[PDB]
Amino acid sequence: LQMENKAWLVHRQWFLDLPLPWLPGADTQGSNWIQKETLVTFKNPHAKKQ
Amino acid sequence: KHPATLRKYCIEAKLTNTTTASRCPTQGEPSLNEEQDKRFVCKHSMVDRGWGNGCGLFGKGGIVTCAMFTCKKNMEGKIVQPENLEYTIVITPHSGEEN
Amino acid sequence: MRCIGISNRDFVEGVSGGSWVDIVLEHGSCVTTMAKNKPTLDFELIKTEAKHPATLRKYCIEAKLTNTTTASRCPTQGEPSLNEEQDKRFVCKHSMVDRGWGNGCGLFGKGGIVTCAMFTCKKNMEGKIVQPENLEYTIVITPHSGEENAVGNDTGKHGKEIKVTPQSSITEAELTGYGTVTMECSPRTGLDFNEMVLLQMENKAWLVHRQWFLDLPLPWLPGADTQGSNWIQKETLVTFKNPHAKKQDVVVLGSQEGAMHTALTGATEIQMSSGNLLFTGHLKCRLRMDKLQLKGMSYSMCTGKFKVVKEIAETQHGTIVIRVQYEGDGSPCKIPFEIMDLEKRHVLGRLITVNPIVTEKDSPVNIEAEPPFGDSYIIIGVEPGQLKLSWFKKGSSIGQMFETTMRGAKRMAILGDTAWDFGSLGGVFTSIGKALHQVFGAIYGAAFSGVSWTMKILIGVVITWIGMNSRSTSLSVSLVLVGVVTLYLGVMVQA
Amino acid sequence: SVALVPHVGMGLETRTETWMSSEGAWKHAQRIETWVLRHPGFTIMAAILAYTIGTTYFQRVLIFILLTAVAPSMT
Amino acid sequence: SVALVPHVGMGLETRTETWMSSEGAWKHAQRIETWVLRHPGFTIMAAILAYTIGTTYFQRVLIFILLTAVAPSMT
Numbered sequence: 001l002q003m004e005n006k007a008w009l010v011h012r013q014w015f016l017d018l019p020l021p022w023l024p025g026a027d028t029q030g031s032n033w034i035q036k037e038t039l040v041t042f043k044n045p046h047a048k049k050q
Numbered sequence: 051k052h053p054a055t056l057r058k059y060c061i062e063a064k065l066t067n068t069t070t071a072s073r074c075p076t077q078g079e080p081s082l083n084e085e086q087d088k089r090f091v092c093k094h095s096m097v098d099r100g101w102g103n104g105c106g107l108f109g110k111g112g113i114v115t116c117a118m119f120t121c122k123k124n125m126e127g128k129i130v131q132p133e134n135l136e137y138t139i140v141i142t143p144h145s146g147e148e149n
Numbered sequence: 150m151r152c153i154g155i156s157n158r159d160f161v162e163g164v165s166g167g168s169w170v171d172i173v174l175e176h177g178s179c180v181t182t183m184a185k186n187k188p189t190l191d192f193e194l195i196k197t198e199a200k201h202p203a204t205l206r207k208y209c210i211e212a213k214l215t216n217t218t219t220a221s222r223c224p225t226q227g228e229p230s231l232n233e234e235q236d237k238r239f240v241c242k243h244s245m246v247d248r249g250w251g252n253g254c255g256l257f258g259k260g261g262i263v264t265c266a267m268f269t270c271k272k273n274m275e276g277k278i279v280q281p282e283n284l285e286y287t288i289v290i291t292p293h294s295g296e297e298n299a300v301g302n303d304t305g306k307h308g309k310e311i312k313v314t315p316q317s318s319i320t321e322a323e324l325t326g327y328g329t330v331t332m333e334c335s336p337r338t339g340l341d342f343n344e345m346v347l348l349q350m351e352n353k354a355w356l357v358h359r360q361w362f363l364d365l366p367l368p369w370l371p372g373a374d375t376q377g378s379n380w381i382q383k384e385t386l387v388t389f390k391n392p393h394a395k396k397q398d399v400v401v402l403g404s405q406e407g408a409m410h411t412a413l414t415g416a417t418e419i420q421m422s423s424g425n426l427l428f429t430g431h432l433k434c435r436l437r438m439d440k441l442q443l444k445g446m447s448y449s450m451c452t453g454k455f456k457v458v459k460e461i462a463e464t465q466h467g468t469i470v471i472r473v474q475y476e477g478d479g480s481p482c483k484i485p486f487e488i489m490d491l492e493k494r495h496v497l498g499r500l501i502t503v504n505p506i507v508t509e510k511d512s513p514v515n516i517e518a519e520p521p522f523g524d525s526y527i528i529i530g531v532e533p534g535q536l537k538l539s540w541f542k543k544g545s546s547i548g549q550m551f552e553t554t555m556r557g558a559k560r561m562a563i564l565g566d567t568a569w570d571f572g573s574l575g576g577v578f579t580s581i582g583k584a585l586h587q588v589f590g591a592i593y594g595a596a597f598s599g600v601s602w603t604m605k606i607l608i609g610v611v612i613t614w615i616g617m618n619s620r621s622t623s624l625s626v627s628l629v630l631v632g633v634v635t636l637y638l639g640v641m642v643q644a
Numbered sequence: 645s646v647a648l649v650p651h652v653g654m655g656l657e658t659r660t661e662t663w664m665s666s667e668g669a670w671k672h673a674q675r676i677e678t679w680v681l682r683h684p685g686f687t688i689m690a691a692i693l694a695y696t697i698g699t700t701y702f703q704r705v706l707i708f709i710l711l712t713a714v715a716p717s718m719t
Numbered sequence: 720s721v722a723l724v725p726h727v728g729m730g731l732e733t734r735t736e737t738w739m740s741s742e743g744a745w746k747h748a749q750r751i752e753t754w755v756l757r758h759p760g761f762t763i764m765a766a767i768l769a770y771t772i773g774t775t776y777f778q779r780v781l782i783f784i785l786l787t788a789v790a791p792s793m794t
């Protein structure tokens with residue numbers, strides 16, 4: 001696991017269980033992130049707007 | 051050696067093109083053309099609707115809002131085949147001397 | 150007319166002796182108040198504002214480390230010294246490394262080592278406070294005038310706006326044609342602003358708890374700081390690594406914006422970008438009906454023919470709204486509106502838009518009523534030519550009673566004892582209930598503060614079981630009641 | 645981490661929706677479910693321990709639930 | 720969030736110091752202590768409930784510890 005010039009050795013199931021959006025790995029353009037809902041929040045205070 | 055990525059996670063993103071579709075009560079959930087788009091993140095909710103909203107039925111009108119998800123920072127998850135490891139070992143004898 | 154169309158709408162009926170009614174004005178909802186011979190009014194709290202907030206503390210959420218330096222000493226010779234240890238902008242740590250002949254020591258023990266790096270903060274999480282005195286509340290009063298565009302119209306061009314502040318206890322709004330309405334609000338007793346923080350982080354704000362905020366584990370500054378470099382709890386945003394007891398290094402430990410966003414779960418968002426606006430919370434006001442006089446009273450009844458310009462629509466609360474136009478000679482007249490039974494011998498439905506009037510011949514007055522459950526006729530106009538519209542209201546009296554009970558319970562869940570002020574008109578029972586609620590709510594809030602809804606559900610289940618397996622009838626019933634209330638609250642908490 | 649000290653039980657909740665109420669309503673229960681699925685072995689041993697300690701099924705079930713809920717938490 | 724699944728009991732551990740091992744060792748217990756100090760009311764209720772439920776003193780202490788450990792974290 002490499003993150004901004006820092007790398008860790010981690011369990012593979014743990015890595016695959018992370019709640020962040022991910023790309024397949026061969027993806028070369030982004031644009032198909034999977035769990036995009038984990039990195040966004042939809043707010044509907046009352047029932048006026050979303 | 052020769053790591054292969056199996057997943058690239060997003061640790062920081064941004065949303066750019068927000069759009070909303072609204073539908074009057076009992077008309078079903080609305081649809082945005084960008085729900086088919088995989089680079090957009092979408093959600094279906096309900097808002098109060100009535101004459102004041104230019105609707106005419108006074109109920110919970112479904113609403114859908116979408117935005118474009120763009121990753122600004124990711125963390126690679128490279129994997130390596132067990133055959134590609136290389137352990138380096140130093141064997142030094144107690145010669146009592148120096149290099 | 151502004152409340153028509155809002156899901157969180159409350160009907161308050163009647164005024165105490167002395168013609169005042171006590172109502173609570175929550176954000177996102179609104180209250181319609183009706184009293185005999187008094188106009189029907191729509192009250193909505195549309196804005197809370199905090200003025201001149203004071204910074205209480207600045208948290209660091211993203212830092213950087215530079216000018217890293219280390220000092221070593223041979224074993225048993227004490228601690229190493231670093232000139233940067235004197236400065237508090239440097240985060241430092243002492244540790245032991247293996248020393249020996251190989252690395253220049255005559256001894257073979259654990260030598261002390263000190264690593265110092267300069268801590269610089271890049272992003273802030275400022276948390277501000279407001280005195281309850283600078284707490285401008287904004288209320289919009291719209292009468293049920295029946296105007297064509299009045300229904301559900303949030304533009305507020307046809308509704309009076311009154312600003313409530315602790316400086317003046319009494320607010321007067323002149324409603325053109327309806328006299329003057331007097332609200333005596335309690336801006337000091339709403340959100341306890343001396344126990345909350347206006348937390349602002351990167352173009353977002355949250356209304357958080359003062360103690361929770363002061364308990365945040367991050368580097369911070371006292372709030373009056375000007376140099377902004379003597380961060381205090383810096384060790385919470387830095388890592389000291391001594392991997393193999395050989396070399397010690399320091400890393401800055403990432404950016405905590407997302408971690409804070411997750412931490413702020415359960416905190417209502419606010420707008421501090423410009424003005425520190427709040428669109429959450431309530432405001433308890435006492436309404437004065439004394440000077441409210443029906444508009445269009447002292448008018449002759451409309452004898453001409455009416456037409457329906459917008460079919461009857463049923464709102465979410467069992468009240469229909471229809472728009473009718475007039476074609477007759479006595480333009481400024483009062484509309485003959487009635488809700489009868491199918492035989493036309495009993496008046497079943499009450500008019501929410503009490504005393505509708507045709508101000509203009511060409512202007513389509515719209516009016517709201519509450520028809521009875523089942524079939525009924527909406528008669529508009531006098532006999533010569535008169536509209537007779539059939540309506541069916543779905544539901545029941547038992548269902549309405551259940552829904553009213555559930556709504557009252559929910560109001561008691563969001564509000565504490567303040568739910569006993571929502572529609573109170575004096576009343577010894579109301580006061581006693583509010584006092585018992587105050588005591589029980591104190592006990593409950595003490596016993597359940599800082600717990601999630603799942604834990605509340607678990608505790609409620611446990612207490613209900615304990616009561617069910619009690620051999621004392623009084624204690625059994627009390628425990629079952631407490632457990633059921635706890636379960637209900639856990640189900641209803643959050644958001 | 646700050647993320648381990650959320651603002652949930654502070655008792656300031658109004659009728660207005662909170663920061664991540666929809667998302668965070670079931671996040672902890674989802675985490676417990678996922679952990680219990682990925683680590684069945686601790687579930688069996690926690691059940692055995694609760695059954696042994698608990699003299700009555702109420703005590704046993706409560707102990708098992710608390711153990712299973714707390715194991716992923718510290719984890 | 721990701722911070723709630725902190726890669727602890729995964730094996731893979733060695734002599735080499737792990738990441739954030741000095742702090743994460745005790746930060747959970749520090750957090751529970753701070754919560755118990757900041758919310759005395761719940762701890763009293765937890766003790767009372769554990770006493771009511773626990774037949775023996777072992778069961779009561781175990782239940783109380785589990786309850787007070789899961790109360791803040793379950794949040």
Ligand SMILES: *[C@@H]1O[C@H](CO)[C@@H](O)[C@H](O)[C@H]1NC(C)=O
Nearest residue numbers: 066067068069084087090118
């Ligand atoms: C998104 O918005 C930008 C404007 O910033 C525009 O140039 C672009 O075409 C839009 N993309 C869409 C709507 O897919």
Ligand SMILES: *[C@@H]1O[C@H](CO)[C@@H](O)[C@H](O)[C@H]1NC(C)=O
Nearest residue numbers: 101102103104298302304306
């Ligand atoms: C609300 O009022 C404005 C001005 O009074 C008017 O232009 C509008 O048509 C009305 N109805 C709305 C906005 O639905």
Ligand SMILES: *[C@@H]1O[C@H](CO)[C@@H](O)[C@H](O)[C@H]1NC(C)=O
Nearest residue numbers: 215216217233236238239267
């Ligand atoms: C830290 O290093 C920078 C160079 O990157 C230098 O300009 C600055 O004066 C140094 N500060 C101290 C306190 O030594």
